[PDB]
Enzyme design. Structure first.
Site, PDB file in Angstrom:
ATOM      1  N   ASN A 180       0.953  -1.104   0.094  1.00  0.00           N
ATOM      2  CA  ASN A 180      -0.087  -0.031  -0.165  1.00  0.00           C
ATOM      3  C   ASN A 180       0.930   1.336   0.099  1.00  0.00           C
ATOM      4  O   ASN A 180       0.537   2.327  -0.612  1.00  0.00           O
ATOM      5  CB  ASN A 180      -1.124  -0.102   1.312  1.00  0.00           C
ATOM      6  CG  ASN A 180      -1.999  -0.754   1.259  1.00  0.00           C
ATOM      7  OD1 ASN A 180      -2.361  -1.334   2.144  1.00  0.00           O
ATOM      8  ND2 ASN A 180      -2.546  -1.341   0.128  1.00  0.00           N
ATOM      9  N   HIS A 230      -1.567  -6.608   6.588  1.00  0.00           N
ATOM     10  CA  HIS A 230      -2.909  -6.727   7.172  1.00  0.00           C
ATOM     11  C   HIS A 230      -2.728  -7.316   8.650  1.00  0.00           C
ATOM     12  O   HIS A 230      -3.480  -8.259   9.057  1.00  0.00           O
ATOM     13  CB  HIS A 230      -3.983  -7.686   6.445  1.00  0.00           C
ATOM     14  CG  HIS A 230      -4.362  -6.755   5.206  1.00  0.00           C
ATOM     15  ND1 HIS A 230      -5.194  -7.535   4.281  1.00  0.00           N
ATOM     16  CD2 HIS A 230      -4.134  -5.662   4.637  1.00  0.00           C
ATOM     17  CE1 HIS A 230      -5.374  -6.567   3.246  1.00  0.00           C
ATOM     18  NE2 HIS A 230      -4.925  -5.461   3.500  1.00  0.00           N
ATOM     19  N   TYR A 239       0.461  -8.963  -1.483  1.00  0.00           N
ATOM     20  CA  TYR A 239       0.897  -7.375  -1.075  1.00  0.00           C
ATOM     21  C   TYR A 239       2.371  -7.075  -1.468  1.00  0.00           C
ATOM     22  O   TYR A 239       2.844  -5.888  -1.683  1.00  0.00           O
ATOM     23  CB  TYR A 239       0.676  -6.992   0.242  1.00  0.00           C
ATOM     24  CG  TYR A 239      -0.921  -6.685   0.501  1.00  0.00           C
ATOM     25  CD1 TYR A 239      -1.284  -5.599  -0.056  1.00  0.00           C
ATOM     26  CD2 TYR A 239      -1.988  -7.822   0.736  1.00  0.00           C
ATOM     27  CE1 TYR A 239      -2.830  -5.268   0.053  1.00  0.00           C
ATOM     28  CE2 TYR A 239      -3.076  -7.552   0.574  1.00  0.00           C
ATOM     29  CZ  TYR A 239      -3.782  -6.168   0.373  1.00  0.00           C
ATOM     30  OH  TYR A 239      -5.077  -6.036   0.359  1.00  0.00           O
ATOM     31  N   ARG A 293      -6.036 -14.121   0.121  1.00  0.00           N
ATOM     32  CA  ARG A 293      -7.226 -14.192  -0.551  1.00  0.00           C
ATOM     33  C   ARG A 293      -7.233 -14.121  -2.208  1.00  0.00           C
ATOM     34  O   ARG A 293      -8.206 -14.404  -2.615  1.00  0.00           O
ATOM     35  CB  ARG A 293      -8.383 -13.157  -0.070  1.00  0.00           C
ATOM     36  CG  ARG A 293      -7.974 -11.637  -0.422  1.00  0.00           C
ATOM     37  CD  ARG A 293      -8.848 -10.816   0.453  1.00  0.00           C
ATOM     38  NE  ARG A 293      -8.927  -9.253  -0.319  1.00  0.00           N
ATOM     39  CZ  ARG A 293      -8.087  -8.370  -0.270  1.00  0.00           C
ATOM     40  NH1 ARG A 293      -7.144  -8.259   0.318  1.00  0.00           N
ATOM     41  NH2 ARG A 293      -8.448  -7.366  -1.136  1.00  0.00           N
TER      42      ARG A 293
END
Length: 721
Positions: A180, A230, A239, A293
């Site tokens: 991110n 996370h 990620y 996921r």
């Protein structure tokens, strides 16, 4: 206005599209151009015009659904790519230029502006849509005024003013790290260049630099190669992908701004590649246990996801020099060339990425040698990855602990990942397609391979949990041998097992003890659930006698062995039971849709055939024990099981151990601090995990205490007889 900011945006345009590198005679580039031609054609034939509509496209019409904002702006980016490609039929097309310009105006005044608030997913408002707006304006900067570019990016400054935090306009902002945080760079460094804003540029680059720090705790990359995102989820392969993919795009631009990044700082990137990413790549596939996921996305199966990493590495190689460049080139080349299943070009989505890959593959000066054996114990994310180069198989072990979440169900994705870290194992063999071609929507989620579970029903609405126990971890001796354990309790605290794994170069032993069940549900361990190929059938043997499997489960009492025999030895799988065991097997067509496990995916029916092997545990104190032996022929497997006749040392509530006499190596797990005497040769003294080798009269020792996450001086844990 032309200046150093637009010079940087020209460089950016070369990276995100690469029209400058386009060659109509280059077949791979021509394929990507045709894909983009078709996308723009569809958009133009689909778009609403007349009387200032309610939506630009019907398929993306409900603006309460935040994914519709991003998908809409991504259509304009595609138009901007083609309008600036001299070989496109839309090159400088008057309709396309006005469509982009007037489409930006309509969305600006009706749908996405500073006056709006987030509705749905924050990531569309702060990442996906701003990236698409930035790229559109960068590519088409010669068709917009500076005042229009400022007007159309003011919304990005409203939603994302602060390069250290996301969700700034909400009541629960969070600190940006990892993937991110790289996306923060693709949002604010590019918006900063477009709006000619030095403070946005410098402040954002400074924020991004925290990505180069290895962490002791929380989100980011660890010294042992683990990557957490996370809060507490193993996440290198989704990620982490975004991190390396995005950063490798930005760096050539950042390094030519007024605020370049110190080379000393960036040296950590090569650590990521060697310690974190490379071990998770086997025959061109990125191990699913690292992808969270994202396994539930039909367009992102493991060979496809791997290209995100590989293209990142290859870009880093290109900005490096000398021996560091050559060695990274060689890593990409050997991985790509080992992949006979997936065509890497299918996920190279810019002309410079295609060109770089072509140059690499045809350059005889870049070595392409098969990768050597390795074993990575990613203890800080409770995963282990093993690869044997001599025999050609990989093995992944997916665990969790009090320190990590078992599975991520979020944004309606990965609804049935319940058991994917309950001691699930992966085998990577000559069937490179195994975990692809619809494995994830067709696998039976109640029978994940390796896992010990009851048959209670599970809700799709459930979310992940951490494990009660910290006693989960791997002791690595060398690049071929390691031992792992997991003090397992199931999701509702009705079942326990001491599960342990003994990685012994060319085989893995699975031991389970202390299996207890306080529910009225039935308990079993899934020995395997293997996806079959109709073109390459297995002949199945039980106790070396052919067996005919059916859809209906068949019981095989007193089983010493099962052998799955392919025409290709590199797909063979053998299971040797140390003590005769009672198992059941079936071969069945299993049906499902990607939508079943991820709301946003297609409801189209998918099917695959699976061979399931299971062992029931009807009594408290039950146990299992077997050796998985891949990649050998039937006669060799039969010989090996005779060699391994007395390899089981112990499998009880306090001590589990297997001995490989050929190597002189023991794996041992101790659940208490009793003195355990092993093979009449030595004693091990402390609760924890051990891998030990005898070389003549000396012992090499690898001890790990999973709970304190420490080793220990040899004399505390080991005593020679």
């Amino acid at each position: 206005v032309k200046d150093t900011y637009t010079d940087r945006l020209d460089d950016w345009n070369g990276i995100i599209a690469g029209n400058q590198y386009y060659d109509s005679k280059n077949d791979q580039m021509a394929k990507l151009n045709q894909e983009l031609e078709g996308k723009v054609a569809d958009s133009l034939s689909s778009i609403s015009s007349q009387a200032d509509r309610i939506y630009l496209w019907e398929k993306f019409s409900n603006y309460k659904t935040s994914a519709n904002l991003t998908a809409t702006y991504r259509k304009l980016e595609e138009m901007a790519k083609q309008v600036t490609n001299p070989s496109s039929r839309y090159y400088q097309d008057e309709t396309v230029v006005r469509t982009v310009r007037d489409s930006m105006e309509w969305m600006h005044k009706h749908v996405y502006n500073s006056e709006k608030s987030i509705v749905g997913n924050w990531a569309d408002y702060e990442i996906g849509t701003p990236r698409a707006i930035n790229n559109t304006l960068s590519l088409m900067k010669e068709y917009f005024s500076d005042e229009e570019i400022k007007k159309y990016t003011d919304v990005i400054e409203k939603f994302v003013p602060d390069p250290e935090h996301f969700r700034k306009t909400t009541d629960n902002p969070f600190k940006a790290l990892g993937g991110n945080l790289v996306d923060m760079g693709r949002v604010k460094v590019i918006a900063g260049l477009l709006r000619k804003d030095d403070q946005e540029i410098s402040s954002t680059i400074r924020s991004i630099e925290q990505v180069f720090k290895l962490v002791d705790q929380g989100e980011g990359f660890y010294q042992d190669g683990s990557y957490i995102d996370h809060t507490n989820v193993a996440y290198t392969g989704a990620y982490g992908n975004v991190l390396i993919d995005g950063l490798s795009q930005l760096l050539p631009v950042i390094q030519k701004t007024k605020n370049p990044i110190d080379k000393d700082k960036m040296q950590t990137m090569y650590h990521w590649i060697d310690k974190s990413f490379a071990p998770l790549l086997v025959n061109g596939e990125l191990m699913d246990m690292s992808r969270g996921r994202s396994i539930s996305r039909a367009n992102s199966e493991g060979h496809v996801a791997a290209v995100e990493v590989l293209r990142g590495i290859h870009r880093i190689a290109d900005m490096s020099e000398g021996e560091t460049k050559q060695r990274l080139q060689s890593l990409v080349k050997t991985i790509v060339q080992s992949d006979s299943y997936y065509d890497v070009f299918k996920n190279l989505k810019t002309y410079k990425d295609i060109s770089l890959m072509q140059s690499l593959l045809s350059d005889a000066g870049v070595a392409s040698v098969p990768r050597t054996s390795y074993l990575s114990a990613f203890n800080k994310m409770d995963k282990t990855a093993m690869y044997n180069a001599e025999k050609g198989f990989g093995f992944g072990l997916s665990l969790f602990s009090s320190r990590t979440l078992n599975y991520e169900h979020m944004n309606k994705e990965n609804k049935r990942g319940w058991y994917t870290s309950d001691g699930m194992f992966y085998l990577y063999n000559g069937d490179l397609s195994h975990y692809s071609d619809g494995y994830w929507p067709t696998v039976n989620p109640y029978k994940m391979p390796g896992t010990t579970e009851t048959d209670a029903k599970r809700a799709d609405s459930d979310t992940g949990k951490v494990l009660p126990s910290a006693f989960v971890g791997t002791s690595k001796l060398d690049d071929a041998n390691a031992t792992a354990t997991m003090d397992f309790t199931n999701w509702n605290q009705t079942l326990t097992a001491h599960k342990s794994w003994f990685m012994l170069k060319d085989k893995i032993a699975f031991l389970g003890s202390n299996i207890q069940n306080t529910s009225t549900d039935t308990a079993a361990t899934t020995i395997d659930q293997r996806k079959l190929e109709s073109s390459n059938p297995y002949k199945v043997y039980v106790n070396d006698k052919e067996a005919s499997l059916t859809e209906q489960e068949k019981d095989y009492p007193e089983t010493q062995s099962v052998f799955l025999e392919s025409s290709d030895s590199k797909k063979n799988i053998g299971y040797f039971f140390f003590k005769k065991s009672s198992i059941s097997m079936s071969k069945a067509l299993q049906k499902g849709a990607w939508k079943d496990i991820n709301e946003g995916q297609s409801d189209k029916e998918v099917e695959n055939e699976f061979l399931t092997i299971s062992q029931a545990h009807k009594q408290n104190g039950d146990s299992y024990g077997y050796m998985l032996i891949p990649n050998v022929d039937r006669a060799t497997f039969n010989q090996m099981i005779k060699e391994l006749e007395s390899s089981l040392i112990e499998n009880n509530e306090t001590l589990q151990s297997v001995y490989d006499a050929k190597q002189g190596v023991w794996g041992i797990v101790k659940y208490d601090d009793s003195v355990s005497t092993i093979s009449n040769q030595f004693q091990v003294l402390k609760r924890g995990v051990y891998t030990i080798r005898k070389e003549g009269d000396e012992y090499k020792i690898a001890y790990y205490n999973p709970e304190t996450q420490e080793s220990a001086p040899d004399q505390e844990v080991f005593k020679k007889l």
